[PDB]
Amino acid sequence: DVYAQEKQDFVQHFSQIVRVLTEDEMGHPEIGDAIARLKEVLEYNAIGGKYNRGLTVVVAFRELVEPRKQDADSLQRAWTVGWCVELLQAFFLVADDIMDSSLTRRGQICWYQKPGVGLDAINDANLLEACIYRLLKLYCREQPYYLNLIELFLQSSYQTEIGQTLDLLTAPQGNVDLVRFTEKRYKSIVKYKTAFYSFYLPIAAAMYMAGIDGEKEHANAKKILLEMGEFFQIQDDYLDLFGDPSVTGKIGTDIQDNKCSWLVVQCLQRATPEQYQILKENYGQKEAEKVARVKALYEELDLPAVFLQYEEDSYSHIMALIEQYAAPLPPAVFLGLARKIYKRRK
């Protein structure tokens, strides 16, 4: 609703972000070709997703700062920092698509699959990460929350990389890992790989920008936001397989990649010993017929209906956590975000 509202406004600011990041081109002409590559990287990889994280920073900021303190420069810093969380996302996805052997992202061929790009996209991804701290320095360097924001982005990156490491370790190519795909492990993976940077980070950044820096306040927000991020990753796994690629913009790879998906964890909890064999013989391999076999098993087990029920119960639980932990922050802060992702198809 409020997200829907701010969406055109937020995307319109992207041209300024690009302009400012590429403005070193007059002062140091010797790096002109690299800066033209950076602009190409930014245009391809920072546009076309939902902008949920960047929008959350902007919306939260507006709801947390007294309107009389929202002058032009303040607002600009807020949307700049929203764009930083978007650049973080861009960095992670570019690299992740290489590591997951993915084909499409946000409705187009993955950056690394473009002819002429390939593993150069590794450097590209890191340049996106570098842009975050260039923007923080250009816009927020004089603010009392500058160090807090730097440390929050760096810590958020580390936690996300640790998540990514548990993701890759639980999914060896070439090895059947069924014994490792447990509820407990799944929760640990998604807490680190998705929830810190996609839920806690944007709200925490707007909190620090609003001068809300207390540990108790951050720990309360974190309780809501981490559970929100677990739920969002369960949706992401559901969408990898049962989503429409023309709506989600991406082709699924979790089964081929041997991933500890929410779907395989649920499959294992309900599997007969015979169906367990079907999973063991078919999971984590590149053959289309083996992937289809696993999908048919999930459908045979009513997993889409089980996903609908989990989502209702978990949404109710997040709503209870908001009732417990939102204060003294406006509940709308957390609700706008829950409503943006409840029942999402992309």
Ligand X SMILES: CC(C)Oc1ccc(-c2ccnc(NC(P(=O)(O)O)P(=O)(O)O)c2)cc1
Annotate each residue in 201-240 with x if it binds Mg ion (CB under 5 A) or - if it does not, as one string: -----------------------------------x---x
Pick one of 2, 47, 150, 176: the residue that binds a second copy (CB under 8 A).
150
Q: And the tokens for 291? A: 């992937």
User: Was 53 annotated as part of a binding site?
Assistant: yes
Pick one of 47, 162, 268, 335: the residue that binds a second copy (CB under 8 A).
162
CA–CA separation, 200 and 336 (whole Å) = 14
Runs of H (alpha helix) within the chain: 2-12, 14-21, 24-27, 32-45, 52-64, 72-99, 121-140, 146-170, 183-190, 201-209, 215-242, 245-248, 262-270, 273-282, 288-300, 303-325, 331-341
Asked whether position 126 contacts a second copy by CB under 8 A, the answer is: yes
Active site residue 91: yes
182 vs 275, beta carbon nearer ligand X = 182
CA-closest candidate to residue 222, choices 59, 315, 334: 334
Contact between 198 and 304 (Cβ < 8 Å): no
The catalytic position among 61, 77, 105, 257 is 105
User: Was 340 annotated as part of a binding site?
Assistant: no
Active site residue 236: yes
Active site residue 167: yes
Pick one of 24, 63, 96, 177: the residue that binds Mg ion (CB under 5 A).
96
Active site residue 343: no
CA 269 to chain centre: 27
90-98, 177-185, 213-221, 281-289 -> range binding ligand X (CB under 6 A) = 90-98
Give the CA count within 13 Å in the CB-facing half-sphere of 290: 16
Q: What is the DSSP string of 258-292?
A: T---HHHHHHHHH--HHHHHHHHHHTT---HHHHH
174 CB neighbour count, 10 Å cutoff: 7
In the region spanning residues 91 to 120, those forming contacts with ligand X, defined by CB under 6 A, are 92-93, 95-96, 100
Active site residue 191: no
Give the CA count within 13 Å in the CB-facing half-sphere of 2: 17
Q: Tell me which residues touch Mg ion (CB under 5 A).
A: 96, 100, 236, 240
Q: Active-site residues: which are they?
A: 50, 91, 96, 100, 105, 167, 193, 232, 236-237
Residues that bind a second copy (CB under 8 A): 30-31, 33-35, 37-38, 95, 98-99, 116, 118-120, 122-124, 126-127, 130, 133-134, 137, 147, 150-151, 154, 157-158, 161-166, 168-169, 172-173, 188, 191-192
Residues that bind ligand X (CB under 6 A): 92-93, 95-96, 100, 122-123, 126, 160-161, 164, 193-194, 236, 240
